[PDB]
Design a protein around this ligand. Structure first.
Ligand SMILES: CCCCCCCCCCCCCCCCCC(=O)OC[C@H](COP(=O)([O-])OCC(O)COP(=O)([O-])OC[C@@H](COC(=O)CCCCCCCCCCCCCCCCC)OC(=O)CCCCCCCCCCCCCCCCC)OC(=O)CCCCCCCCCCCCCCCCC
Ligand SMILES: CCCCCCCCCCCCO[C@@H]1O[C@H](CO)[C@@H](O[C@H]2O[C@H](CO)[C@@H](O)[C@H](O)[C@H]2O)[C@H](O)[C@H]1O
Ligand SMILES: CCCCCCCCCCCCO[C@@H]1O[C@H](CO)[C@@H](O[C@H]2O[C@H](CO)[C@@H](O)[C@H](O)[C@H]2O)[C@H](O)[C@H]1O
Lengths: 52, 82, 63, 160, 112, 108, 226
């Protein structure tokens, strides 16, 4: 779970440095990564239904 | 006795000498709190304690600033993450 | 005050040592988590590695 | 040997679990696993940071004035998957140096692989003068050392 | 009396303007919105989904995230219609010919 | 021979004048504007109750246009502002139900 | 067939759109009259401002020919400024219609080269001032986007405030002057970023014992601070 948290933090940092507030995809990307953070303690099968 | 020119000293005395017991009590309370903190440190702690700091909230599930610890859900080979 | 100061000097020395070692252990923990993430990522690399000569995504003609 | 690979991965996870359960103060209890882990290494060409972790644990309870920095960095570089990027050059020289592997030189902003000595310099009037002269030459500022007014005194430097 | 507002106090002047005979809803000024990216974003999302330009233009809809509607248009409906009738009949209420309806509405809305 | 356009532009000018007179503290001027705000248009009068009961896509189009023209939220207590807003919205509703609006830059 | 019959109610009914029109057409419906906005405030060119600049109060030089008559801010305003709305306030520091230093390029490569060297942007040269409503719309959209980005962030309102101050100071047409005003909120946001990071990652330090003269006077209260 700790490594999953680290991976999600890396994704978020990278994507926020890449996309600025004027970028359209920033909000969807951040929302998806937030859903991942919420669903860390789960399996991919159960996480797909929620993050799709 | 007194006089108008001694109003400064009269006021200062009347307002300060009654506070000396409270000042001494505050000093004694600080000494006792330091003693208890040092006894607890000697007994042992998971994370360190800052002696001369106001508040020490750190524990196994709390940072040294009152927030939850990051990356503390699992276990680590080297033991505590701190 | 001198007795208290001697005791405090000893305690502060020990505390400085412990604080340094604790911060370095935290650093190591984070770096090891990063290493685990990287070890898991390296499995997604295709066989033979990446083709660093061409672009991964070709997004337009070249006429 | 995928069966053996999986078996040794399970063994390594078990070793980590036992080490975590015991703690870094009581680490001499998990010496049972070295017998198998060294064979794993010699067979699969893999490493497990055994000696590095053991040395770090032993040092952090009886620490060095450096506070075990070299042990920390050694463990950090050894736990990397593809291998260490930064190492401590084994040398007959008196001061050791930090060296960078060439295959990863393109990831770091360096001209060479020598990142400097692993110990700080020693205080020396000569070295201080050398650095100051080099800085003065690099700056090339006409006006350094000029004193427009000095307190009138028989002493050359009044005050200082 | 009305003193000059320096340039450093303009951000507060925008969301706390001075009193006027026709004031806006200061409590709602932070809720006034009009998105210039609505249709561009809609088209981008649809084309990324895989639709064509014609399908996108047929599926396009105007933005709902605009400044909210005045609740008076739903609460004071009948009084407003009556006032508008009075105005249409009396030339805009010249020489106080719709004071009746206007005062009824003002009382209903203010309550002293 | 262009009554719709003429009255639209006139109403816009009168709204601007009302705002300016409010800013400059001129009751006489702002009441002159309110009185001159074309209250004798049968089409808009007939569309008013229709707008007060419309719902859905037509209402959203009209509200989008009214936010484009007058985005500032009027005070919920000023009946004059409320009525001028209603009148402008009814005019836009009439124009839309005669010939709908096309607000998207993409179109063909 | 006459043109624009029902389109000039302002003319039919003597309704002035502003005190200037009132004074011009002699409608006389503004009780307080009109104080004309002089031409040096109605139009003009960009000027240097700092006293630590040698060409202070002088027009900015461009690659193209430009009228060097400058916009003069209102330095000695009257006591009564009856209209204290943004509309009437912005005219004291910028011209509503924009500055008069816009180019008409004879070719496209001149425009290209000016942009490439940082001497032209249409956003800056072909544009007017922003109205209060536009400023508010932009600020509210930006605030919504920031909130969607992260609600549990402490520097959110600080970022919103620097955006707001830029918009209010018209950074599109006076970027340097506006940055001069908004760098303070930028600095506060920087500080808040560090503070949030140190609260997230527990970062503290060993505080030293209390000083012998922490209190200047024994009778003084030593208010405790976290
Ligand atoms: C009439 C009364 C008596 C008059 C005489 C009194 C003066 C005696 C001193 C004479 C020695 C002067 C030295 C001359 C050599 C050149 C050096 C020099 O002069 O520079 C000093 C100074 C300028 O120095 P500078 O320009 O900064 O450059 C270098 C520094 O000076 C120095 O370089 P530095 O900065 O690196 O040195 C730092 C440190 C160096 O020194 C030290 O560190 C310590 C020195 C202290 C030593 C203490 C003694 C040691 C004792 C050991 C033994 C102990 C036990 C035994 C004793 C027990 C005691 C009970 O501190 C000093 O410099 C001390 C200097 C003191 C200057 C003299 C102060 C007196 C001003 C005049 C008073 C006038 C009174 C009224 C007169 C009334 C007449 C009507 O100029 C003067 O002091 C001018 C002296 C003029 C004397 C005038 C006498 C009266 C004449 C009247 C004329 C009429 C017209 C006057 C106008 C008003 C009319 C009404
Ligand atoms: C019965 C209890 C003892 C009764 C006698 C009490 C005498 C106390 C007054 C002595 C002067 C104290 O003045 C000042 O207060 C406390 C110690 O008290 C110290 O304060 C510092 O060390 C103490 C440790 O005890 C910490 O709790 C505290 O966070 C830190 O600020 C200061 O270093 C000291 O300079
Ligand atoms: C050739 C012969 C040489 C003789 C050498 C004699 C050495 C004597 C050394 C004593 C030095 C004491 O120095 C002083 O002591 C007191 C308590 O004791 C310290 O402590 C004091 O200040 C600090 C904070 O300011 C706190 O601990 C506390 O508030 C107070 O007790 C001082 O921080 C220290 O500056």
């Amino acid at each position: 779970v700790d490594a999953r948290e680290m991976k999600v933090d890396m994704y978020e940092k990278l994507f926020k440095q890449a996309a600025d507030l004027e970028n359209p995809c920033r909000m969807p990307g951040v929302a998806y990564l937030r859903c991942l953070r919420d669903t860390l303690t789960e399996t991919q099968s159960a996480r797909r239904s929620s993050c799709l | 006795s007194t006089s108008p020119g001694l109003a400064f000293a009269n006021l200062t005395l009347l307002l300060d000498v009654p506070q000396l017991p409270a000042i001494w009590a505050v000093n004694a309370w600080r000494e006792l709190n330091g003693l208890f903190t040092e006894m607890k440190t000697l007994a042992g702690t998971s994370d360190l304690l800052y002696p001369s700091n106001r508040y020490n909230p750190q524990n196994e599930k709390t940072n040294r600033m009152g927030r939850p610890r990051k990356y503390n859900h699992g276990e680590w080979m080297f033991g505590n993450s701190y | 005050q001198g007795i208290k100061t001697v005791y405090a000097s000893c305690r502060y020395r020990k505390l400085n040592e412990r604080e340094i070692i604790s911060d370095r252990y935290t650093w190591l923990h984070e770096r090891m988590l990063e290493d685990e993430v990287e070890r898991v990522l390296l499995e997604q690399v295709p066989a033979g590695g990446f083709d660093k000569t061409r672009p991964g995504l070709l997004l337009g003609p070249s006429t | 040997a995928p069966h053996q690979r999986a078996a040794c991965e399970q063994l390594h996870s078990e070793y980590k679990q036992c080490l975590a359960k015991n703690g870094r103060t009581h680490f001499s209890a998990c010496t049972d696993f070295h017998s198998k882990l060294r064979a794993c290494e010699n067979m699969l060409g893999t490493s497990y940071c055994i000696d590095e972790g053991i040395n770090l644990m032993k040092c952090t309870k009886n620490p060095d004035p450096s506070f075990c920095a070299k042990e920390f960095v050694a463990m950090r570089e050894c736990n990397r998957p593809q291998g260490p990027h930064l190492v401590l050059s084994s040398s007959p020289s008196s001061p050791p140096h930090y060296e960078l592997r060439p295959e990863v030189k393109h990831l770091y902003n360096v001209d060479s692989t020598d990142l400097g000595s692993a110990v700080a310099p020693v205080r020396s009037k000569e070295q201080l003068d050398r650095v100051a002269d080099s800085l003065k030459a690099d700056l090339n500022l006409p006006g350094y050392g000029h004193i427009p007014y000095k307190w009138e005194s028989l002493r050359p430097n009044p005050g200082a | 009396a009305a003193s000059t507002i320096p340039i450093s106090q303009w951000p507060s002047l925008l969301y706390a303007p001075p009193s006027s005979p026709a004031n806006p809803a200061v409590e709602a000024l932070p809720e006034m919105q009009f998105d210039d990216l609505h249709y561009p974003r809609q088209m981008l999302l649809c084309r990324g989904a895989g639709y064509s330009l014609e399908q996108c233009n047929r599926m396009a809809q105007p933005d709902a995230r605009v400044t909210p509607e005045n609740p008076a248009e739903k609460l004071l409906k009948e009084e407003a219609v009556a006032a508008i009738a009075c105005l249409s009949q009396r030339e805009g209420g010249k020489d106080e010919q719709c004071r009746y309806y206007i005062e009824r509405m003002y009382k209903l809305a203010n309550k002293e | 021979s262009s009554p719709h356009m003429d009255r639209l532009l006139g109403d816009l000018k009168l709204l601007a004048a009302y705002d300016s007179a409010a800013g400059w503290q001129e009751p006489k001027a702002m009441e002159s504007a309110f009185q001159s705000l074309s209250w004798d248009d049968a089409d808009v009068l007939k569309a008013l109750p229709q707008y007060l009961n419309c719902r859905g896509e037509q209402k959203r189009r009209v509200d989008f246009a009214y936010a484009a023209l007058c985005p500032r939220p009027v005070d919920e207590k000023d009946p004059k502002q409320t009525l001028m807003s209603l009148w402008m919205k009814a005019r836009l509703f009439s124009y839309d139900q005669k010939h709908p609006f096309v607000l998207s830059p993409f179109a063909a | 067939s006459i043109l624009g019959a029902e389109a000039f109610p302002e003319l039919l009914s003597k309704v002035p759109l502003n005190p200037q029109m009132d004074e011009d057409k002699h409608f006389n419906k503004y009780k307080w009259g009109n104080e004309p906005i002089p031409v040096n405030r109605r139009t003009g060119s960009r000027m240097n401002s700092s006293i630590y600049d040698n060409r202070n109060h002088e027009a900015v030089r461009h690659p193209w020919s430009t009228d060097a008559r400058t916009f003069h801010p209102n330095d000695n305003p009257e006591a009564d400024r009856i209209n204290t709305q943004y509309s009437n306030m912005v005219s004291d520091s910028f011209p509503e219609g924009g500055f008069s230093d816009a180019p008409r390029f004879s070719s496209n490569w001149e425009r290209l080269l000016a942009y490439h060297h940082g001497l032209y942007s249409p956003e800056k040269f072909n544009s007017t001032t922003k109205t209060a409503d536009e400023i508010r719309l932009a600020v509210n959209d930006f605030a919504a986007k920031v909130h969607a980005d992260d609600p549990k962030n402490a520097c959110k309102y600080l970022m919103i405030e620097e955006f707001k101050c830029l918009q209010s100071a018209q950074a599109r047409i006076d970027p340097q002057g506006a940055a001069t005003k908004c760098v303070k909120w930028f600095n506060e946001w920087r500080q808040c970023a560090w503070d949030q990071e140190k609260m997230v990652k527990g970062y503290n330090y060993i505080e030293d014992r209390r000083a012998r003269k922490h209190k200047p006077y024994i009778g003084a209260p030593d208010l405790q601070y976290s």
